[PDB]
Design a protein around this ligand. Structure first.
Ligand SMILES: C[n+]1cn([C@@H]2O[C@H](COP(=O)(O)OP(=O)(O)OP(=O)(O)OC[C@H]3O[C@@H](n4cnc5c(N)ncnc54)[C@H](O)[C@@H]3O)[C@@H](O)[C@H]2O)c2nc(N)[nH]c(=O)c21
Lengths: 1196, 498
């Protein structure tokens, strides 16, 4: 009856009884809220005050459950926590609290009459505590907590573990839940008004902590330490204390990895390969060791003393770099609860986007040429950081002007207006050829856009406009030309592999290397009006050499000009770009105005401009590369050595690598620090010998210390929590595959995602008409379990609940997820599917694997075993898929695979670029629609960006309850299917009929099994684990394949493997069969490169002959991070018997079979070689088809 | 032309270009007027847009194309018979003045043709388009300047009523000249401004004034201090700064001239301020005005506040540029000061000494500089070396938000109980942007002053005043919108109130 006593809990296998038992229990927890309350808050549970056990490296720790009085018995609402100014025009200047304060929930009451200042403030704070806390990804927050504690029960086989005592002592108030969320009102409804205001966030916090226990980062005692820390931080303001603690609680690993002494680490080459190991010393230099004193003194003052004792324990007990990594992952989970951080956007506006002056004032360049309004036309610096940056930036002007002269700018602005014709040309001639457009662009304001994110404050970023962007379209067009001339900016596409971090895996492997990393996200507030004048000199130097006739409303003309030494006005021929860039430089407003409910229009101090868009990310790129490379020129101009190798200005980071003598590297680092102090930034670079820091990544001596806290399984920012099961299951698979090398134990992730999908994603509501209701229930109740609701005579239709079979999570076209061992008829179990298994059509093999392929080969059967599948519910699951009741997913929503990128400079430059190509694809799509062969919008190239641009300019409610109407047509479809339903088998299922028998001969490992065995490349690939042994068998990765997929992805913006069920292919094949003269127009409309056009033209001719034959499988690049993408590496692992070479000519297909099987069965692979066993129907299906029709992507 | 000379003739009367009476260059302006009427009709027929504008551009500008369903080509054949009825040997070039006011009044059917045309651009020296051009010599009357030595009967020269127009630069009355010297049939050009050539320290300096010569009560040889307030309100120097205008410059020549048109971008930013002045949704409306130290800016802005108060009905506050320094020199030692607006304004007197002036004077004494001749004789490296030390005492106030910080001063003055709603705050340099208020609109000001001459000619402070001027110049680029005082007054006259 309880989950910890089940057969699945004790054996972790799916038998006939153990499947139905866990199915019934998760269907009980997923539906009834009496069951959830009694599951969480049961009376037969002993509480824990003192507990003892091992820490993350095995040493024994002692902790104590401590919930403070200030959360149990909360204070009353103090209205002086949110003070106002004396005019009450905005909040007070220095106010401590930007987030919620921990107070008693029933105390915030507004007695004030409407249309008052205090009434608007108390309505906004009521909105803060009831609306902003509703951020849950999948279901009810109590369901998301039940799934976590369910997976903890089933894993650890006990109820006696200390997180459940926190859950009971915090949320056990009465006989019902203390609060619930309501999807209709979009807010939390408090039941017990004597409760604290912060517990809806602590539900999400307990979910994240239980995720961290199942992930293997935290143990049960470290769970007590982490929850005590979070409960101590929740007085009086929780998120303020977290942001005050966060970095200081993490910076200790420098000293912890100093105190190790020596470490043995792998050595990477330039070409993504482990080429050896090396016993190095990790003892830091003296200028690094001088920061340890201030870090000790700041930690011992600020941190909670139990967490400080844990950090001082991690300092003194850590023996190896692997131990330091384990303790760092624990302390990173102890300081982050994964939730998104949300306020009233006028509480956080001040500390988000208010400008500041740092360390110095930046002066002006000397104006050498001016307008008749004395606006500067060209100008030059006398001495200082302006001269230093222009000593490097002025060596590019005469080359950039050639590339600016070649492009048509009126055409580029028409492309922008169209992608974000004659009608648009009339609009252009009406609006953009007049000096009134300049006046409108100076008159209109700038609206403020913010973006929530986890573990960081709300970031203000700039949005796309038509009027303010028209001023700065030309300095953007000039400043974006350095990306093709340097190495210094990283703007390219991200592969998502360990290919993507392979550069800093190389530099932390080399000898005599100093490493810098500047956290530069707060630069856009420190940038001042005189700081932008460094970039203005470069733009005006390019524009003075450029020659464009018209960028309307500007002409090239004889303009009166004042100069230096000339007492009167000269006359020169000043052109359109050097009028536009001069006007935009002379007229500057950086203030952003937000229109609040409390105060009306709230404006910012002039100075800081937010760093979202491309035109202001180019400014932040050009200025930083100019300063740091001009410093390298100035050191040679003064006679000192220059020991810098690379600079990669990432999205939020500047990364320098210095190689040389220790004195040389320290002096060049101190000089590059002092020049950024001079230019007006107070940024402290983190110098290290051996580790290098970014966001979401940490590379320590050729290893990868991934950050698992930055993936939130339980909260969202978009609040698109709808009952769309296909989108929700794809998002669940994406997040589980994203946590996969950041976890220390992926077997915990498989059980946690299993119970998330089984409880949170199980029920599904649909509304049936009244006359067909019981006849629909009697048809669908043979395969599923339904719940009927009350029949209301006042309306036309009634709802009824459809809870899925639990087998739906494991299905090919439905929800797809790695399975557990199912029991065959012979007592043998199917092999436990790993985290490395491929999705797509490869999930159809499970239906034959339960049906005993090893029996099907012996008896020469190919049909199925329908009775076991109807016993486990696979027939009901596949009928649910064939009815097509669930919600469909576009190709655009599929392209949001939700993969965190390494740099966001690429996402900044993504929106506004490639205008001519997106216009060409738009012209192709529209002029192909005119000719009769219309394409769907998800296939056309520019629509994925156009939809995201035009969506965020609407304020409409996207939250509407999802109901499926089963009318008479869908009813008669149900009646036609369910009366004679058995499982359909397409004839291309014969490729799934193959077997691997275990031979008695061990396999030689790769030579880098020895090199990666000392200190771990990731958290999951510790020595002897599944990731390490998969890397020792299949040594990734293929650099020549990843370069090819990035070259292909540099046209389409994204890479997809070819399939015959792709709607791109299906519409292309319709056009190919009907009118082949439009294939060129189609290939322009989809923006295919010349290799993809060859692939598509081979696939059309293969499909016309043979049909859909292909052996399809889907592997994510994030899922296979260090591992190989090429199935030729599995050739040496499986012996093919020599009677198959006589019959067939498909070797590379057999390699794909072996590759997919070894990735599937790495959990139980000990190292023996295998033996391929093929079905005679498989051989007869193969030898009636060429191999190129099966694998049209590959080149034989 | 881009704007029709026969329909909109009163626009062209203001540049001094008057129409010859109605010769193969006289029928052409009738032909162009017929083409403008036909283009206006065809544009208004189809939603304000021409349907095939490249053909119209060819047929009008080049004249090479003849066109012979109902929507599309009927209008083009109607245009082709009209142009073919002219029998011209070539086309008619499209003609555009360099004036921004002219470029912002061109019709939309001409803007649809400018993209496919190589237009002729006529330059304007002082705003008046030059008469030396072909198209303006042939189509409009040519002016004739009467001066004191040139004045005679029209028969002494070869002048006719049909050809020439008179420019009365004599200083005498037009009806007097027209009756006494036989100019009864000639048409006089009307110029409503003024053009003064002053002497200078460096040479000869011109000045354009938007007052009439009778309103501006100056004659030849008058001192600069006479009518200085009217010149400061309505004047613009058309020479490169630094110009030699000082308090002892005398007048060389006065002429009537075309009145200056205020810039549309400056008026856009000032109207953007007046929207927040009017609307009830904004609680505090704040303008930030930057200028060099010595432009005479409080004497203008203190009357700008009066005109804004009269035309608005509300009460307008005004902080000077030295308000925070004159506050801090008293209140730097006080543990809890007073931020009352009438206390700050009472400390805002001119006989109070600023904190920055005291620290700068101690710095100048620490280098042994006490005389304007000693400061003028320094090198550029020495001056920049001293200004880098004044920047260190300027960062100390802008660097944080303490109880005496500049951010806190302007915060507690802006967000007070008794303070006025609409404030006009003056500043010294661009680094105060973060520090002064929360205003969307901030401007930069230019007047008729050589600031390095005013801070050299004055005798009270001298070295400290000129040194703070040079420091504030070094910290103040021209990176916000340049506004003149007549543009700020014209903004209030143009905005519609209530
Ligand atoms: C109590 N409760 C309900 N749910 C969930 O809530 C769902 C339905 O919700 P409810 O039916 O239970 O709630 P209730 O009857 O109390 O709604 P109520 O009448 O109180 O709402 C009235 C509010 O609506 C406002 N209002 C609504 N419409 C209008 C309108 N036109 N005009 C003026 N005011 C309106 C009213 O001012 C008033 O505040 C159920 O499906 C149930 O799973 C819970 N879930 C958990 N996990 N724990 C719970 O305790 C719980």
């Amino acid at each position: 009856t309880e989950l910890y006593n089940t057969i699945f809990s004790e054996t972790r296998k799916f038998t006939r009884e153990s499947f139905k038992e866990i199915e019934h229990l998760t269907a009980k927890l997923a539906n009834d809220r009496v069951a959830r309350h009694d599951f969480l808050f049961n009376n037969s549970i002993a509480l824990i005050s003192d507990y003892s056990g091992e820490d993350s490296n095995g040493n024994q720790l002692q902790a104590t459950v401590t919930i403070p009085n200030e959360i149990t018995n909360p204070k009353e609402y103090d209205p002086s926590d949110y003070p106002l100014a004396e005019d009450e025009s905005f909040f007070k200047q220095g106010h401590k609290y930007d987030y919620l304060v921990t107070f008693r929930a029933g105390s915030l009451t507004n007695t004030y009459e409407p249309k008052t200042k205090m009434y608007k403030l108390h309505a906004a704070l009521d909105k803060l505590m009831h609306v902003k806390q509703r951020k849950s990804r999948f279901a009810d927050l109590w369901r998301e907590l039940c799934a976590v504690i369910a997976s903890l029960d089933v894993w650890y086989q006990t109820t006696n573990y200390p997180l459940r005592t926190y859950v009971k002592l915090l949320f056990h108030k009465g006989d019902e839940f203390p609060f619930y969320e309501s999807p209709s009102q979009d807010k939390i409804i408090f039941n017990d008004k004597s409760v604290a205001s912060i517990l809806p966030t602590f539900v999400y916090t307990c979910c994240q902590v239980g995720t961290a226990i199942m992930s293997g980062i935290l143990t049960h005692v470290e769970s007590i330490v982490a929850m005590n820390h979070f409960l101590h931080c929740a007085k009086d303001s929780y998120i303020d204390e977290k942001l005050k603690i966060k970095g200081i609680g993490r910076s200790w690993y420098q000293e912890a990895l100093h105190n190790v002494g020596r470490a043995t680490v792998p050595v990477w080459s330039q070409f993504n390969e482990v080429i050896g190991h090396r016993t190095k010393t990790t003892s830091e230099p003296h200028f690094v060791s001088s920061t340890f004193i201030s870090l000790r003194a700041k930690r011992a003052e600020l941190l909670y003393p139990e967490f400080n004792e844990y950090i001082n324990r991690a300092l003194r007990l850590s023996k190896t770099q692997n131990d330091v990594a384990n303790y760092y992952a624990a302390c990173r989970a102890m300081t982050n609860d994964g939730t998104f951080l949300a306020t009233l956007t006028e509480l956080s506006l001040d500390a988000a986007v208010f400008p500041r002056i740092e360390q110095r004032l930046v002066t002006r360049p000397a104006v050498l040429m001016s307008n008749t309004r004395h606006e500067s036309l060209k100008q030059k610096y006398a001495n200082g950081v302006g001269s230093i940056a222009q000593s490097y930036l002025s060596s590019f002007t005469d080359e950039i002007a050639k590339r600016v002269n070649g492009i048509h700018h009126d055409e580029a602005w028409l492309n922008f207006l169209t992608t974000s014709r004659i009608v648009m040309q009339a609009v252009f001639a009406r609006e953009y050829r007049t000096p009134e457009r300049i006046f409108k662009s100076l008159k209109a304001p700038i609206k403020l856009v913010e973006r929530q994110q986890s573990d960081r404050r709300q970031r203000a970023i700039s949005g796309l406009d038509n009027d303010r962007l028209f001023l700065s379209f030309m300095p953007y067009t000039i400043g974006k030309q350095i990306y093709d001339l340097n190495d210094n900016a990283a703007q390219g596409k991200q592969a998502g592999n360990a290919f993507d971090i392979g550069e800093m895996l190389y530099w932390t492997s080399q000898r005599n290397v100093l490493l810098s990393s500047i956290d530069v996200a707060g630069m856009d507030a420190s940038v001042t009006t005189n700081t932008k004048d460094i970039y203005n000199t470069f733009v005006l130097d390019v524009a003075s050499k450029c020659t464009v006739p018209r960028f309307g409303p500007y002409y090239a003309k004889n303009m009166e000009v004042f100069e230096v030494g000339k007492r009167q006005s000269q006359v020169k021929y000043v052109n359109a770009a050097w009028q536009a860039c001069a006007l935009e430089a002379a007229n500057s407003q950086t203030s952003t105005s937000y229109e609040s409910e409390i105060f009306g229009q709230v404006k910012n101090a002039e100075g800081t401009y937010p760093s979202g868009r491309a035109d202001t990310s180019t400014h932040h790129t050009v200025l930083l590369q100019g300063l740091v490379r001009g410093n390298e020129l100035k050191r040679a101009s003064d006679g000192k050595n220059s020991c810098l190798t690379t600079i990669k200005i990432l999205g939020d980071d500047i990364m320098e690598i210095f190689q040389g003598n220790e004195n040389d590297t320290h002096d060049h680092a101190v000089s590059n620090a002092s020049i950024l102090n001079e230019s007006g930034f107070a940024t402290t670079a983190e110098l290290s010998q051996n580790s290098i820091v970014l966001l979401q990544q940490l590379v320590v001596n050729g290893t990868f210390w991934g950050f698992a806290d930055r993936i939130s399984l339980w909260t969202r920012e978009d609040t698109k929590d709808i009952g769309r099961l296909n989108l929700a299951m794809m998002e669940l698979n994406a997040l589980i595959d994203d946590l996969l090398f950041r976890v220390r134990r992926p077997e915990g992730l498989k059980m946690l995602g299993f119970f998330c999908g089984a409880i949170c994603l199980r029920r599904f509501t649909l509304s049936v008409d009244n006359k067909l209701y019981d006849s629909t229930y009697n048809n669908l109740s043979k395969y599923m379990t339904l719940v009927k609701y009350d029949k209301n005579p006042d309306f036309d239709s009634t709802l009824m609940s459809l809870i899925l079979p639990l087998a739906w999570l494991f299905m090919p076209r439905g929800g797809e997820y790695p399975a557990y061992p199912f029991e065959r008829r012979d007592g043998t179990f199917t092999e436990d599917e790993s985290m490395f298994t491929a999705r797509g059509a490869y999930k159809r093999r499970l239906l034959y694997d339960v049906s005993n392929i090893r029996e099907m080969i012996q008896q020469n059967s190919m049909v199925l075993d329908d009775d076991l599948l109807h016993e486990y519910g696979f027939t009901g699951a596949l009928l649910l898929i064939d009815l097509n009741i669930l919600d469909l997913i576009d190709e655009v929503k599929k392209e949001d695979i939700s993969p965190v990128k390494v740099n966001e400079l690429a996402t900044s430059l993504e929106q506004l670029g490639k205008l001519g190509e997106r216009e060409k694809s738009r012209r192709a799509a529209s002029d192909l629609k005119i000719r009769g062969h219309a394409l769907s919008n998800d296939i056309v190239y520019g629509y994925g960006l156009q939809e995201k641009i035009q969506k965020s300019a609407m304020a409409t409610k996207e939250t509407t309850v999802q109901s499926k109407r089963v009318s008479s047509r869908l009813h008669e479809v149900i009646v036609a299917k369910t009366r004679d339903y058995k499982i359909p088998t397409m004839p291309a299922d014969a490729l799934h009929l193959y077997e691997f028998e275990v031979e008695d001969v061990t396999v030689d490992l790769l030579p880098h099994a020895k090199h990666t065995s000392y200190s771990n490349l990731a958290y999951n690939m510790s020595f002897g684990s599944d990731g390490w042994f998969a890397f020792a068998l299949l040594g990734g990765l293929d650099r020549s394949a990843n370069l090819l997929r990035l070259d292909v992805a540099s046209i389409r913006g994204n890479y997809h493997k070819f399939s015959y069920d792709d709607p791109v292919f299906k519409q292309g094949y319709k056009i190919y069969k009907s009118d082949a003269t439009l294939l060129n127009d189609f290939f322009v409309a989809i923006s295919a490169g010349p290799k993809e056009q060859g692939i598509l033209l081979r696939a059309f001719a293969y499909y016309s002959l043979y049909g859909n034959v292909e052996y399809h499988y889907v592997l994510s690049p994030r899922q296979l991070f260090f591992l190989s993408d090429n199935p030729v590496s599995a050739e040496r692992l499986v012996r093919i018997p020599p009677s198959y070479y006589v019959s067939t000519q498909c070797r590379a297909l057999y390699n794909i079979f072996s590759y997919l099987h070894i990735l599937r069965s790495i959990t139980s692979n000990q190292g023996k070689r295998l033996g391929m066993v093929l079905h005679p129907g498989l051989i007869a299906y193969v030898r009636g088809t060429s191999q190129g029709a099966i694998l049209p992507e590959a080149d034989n | 032309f881009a704007i029709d000379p026969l329909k909109h003739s009163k626009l062209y009367e203001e540049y001094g270009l008057y129409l010859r009476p109605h010769a193969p260059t006289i029928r052409s302006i009738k032909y162009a007027s017929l083409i403008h009427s036909m283009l206006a009709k065809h544009a208004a027929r189809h939603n304000g847009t021409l349907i095939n504008p490249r053909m119209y551009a060819d047929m009008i500008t080049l004249g090479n194309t003849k066109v012979t369903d109902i929507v599309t080509y009927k209008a083009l054949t109607e245009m082709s018979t009209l142009i073919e009825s002219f029998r011209l040997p070539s086309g008619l070039a499209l003609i555009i003045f360099d004036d921004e006011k002219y470029q912002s009044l061109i019709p939309n059917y001409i803007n649809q043709l400018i993209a496919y045309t190589q237009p002729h651009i006529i330059p304007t020296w002082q705003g008046i388009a030059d008469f030396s051009d072909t198209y303006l010599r042939s189509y409009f009357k040519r002016p004739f300047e009467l001066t004191a030595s040139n004045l005679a009967a029209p028969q002494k020269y070869n002048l006719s009523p049909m050809t020439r127009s008179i420019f009365n630069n004599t200083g005498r009355e037009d009806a007097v000249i027209r009756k006494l010297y036989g100019y009864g049939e000639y048409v006089f050009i009307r110029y409503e401004g003024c053009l003064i050539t002053w002497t200078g320290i460096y040479g000869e300096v011109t000045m354009m004034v938007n007052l009439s010569k009778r309103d501006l009560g100056l004659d030849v040889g008058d001192d600069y201090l006479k009518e200085y307030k009217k010149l400061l309100f309505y004047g613009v120097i058309t020479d490169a700064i630094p110009s030699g205008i000082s308090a002892r410059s005398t007048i060389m020549k006065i002429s009537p001239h075309k009145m200056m048109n205020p810039s549309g971008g400056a008026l856009a930013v000032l109207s953007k301020f007046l929207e927040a002045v009017v609307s009830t949704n904004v609680i505090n409306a704040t303008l930030v005005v930057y200028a060099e130290k010595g432009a005479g800016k409080t004497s203008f802005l203190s009357t700008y506040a009066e005109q804004l108060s009269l035309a608005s009905g509300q009460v307008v506050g005004h902080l000077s540029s030295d308000a925070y320094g004159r506050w801090l020199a008293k209140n730097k030692d006080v543990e809890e000061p007073s931020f009352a607006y009438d206390y700050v304004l009472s400390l805002d007197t001119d006989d109070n000494e600023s904190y920055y002036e005291q620290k700068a004077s101690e710095l100048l004494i620490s280098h042994g500089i006490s005389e304007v001749a000693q400061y003028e004789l320094l090198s550029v490296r020495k001056k920049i070396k001293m200004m880098d030390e004044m920047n260190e005492v300027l960062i100390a106030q802008l660097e944080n938000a303490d109880t005496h910080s500049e951010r806190n001063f302007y915060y507690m003055v802006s967000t007070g109980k008794t303070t006025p709603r609409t404030l006009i705050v003056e500043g010294h340099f661009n680094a105060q942007d973060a520090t002064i208020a929360r205003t969307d609109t901030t401007v930069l000001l230019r007047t008729i002053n050589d600031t390095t001459q005013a801070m050299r000619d004055r005798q009270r402070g001298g070295v400290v005043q000129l040194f703070l001027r040079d420091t504030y110049y070094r910290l103040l680029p021209a990176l916000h919108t340049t506004v003149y005082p007549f543009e700020m007054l014209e903004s209030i006259r143009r905005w519609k109130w209530v």
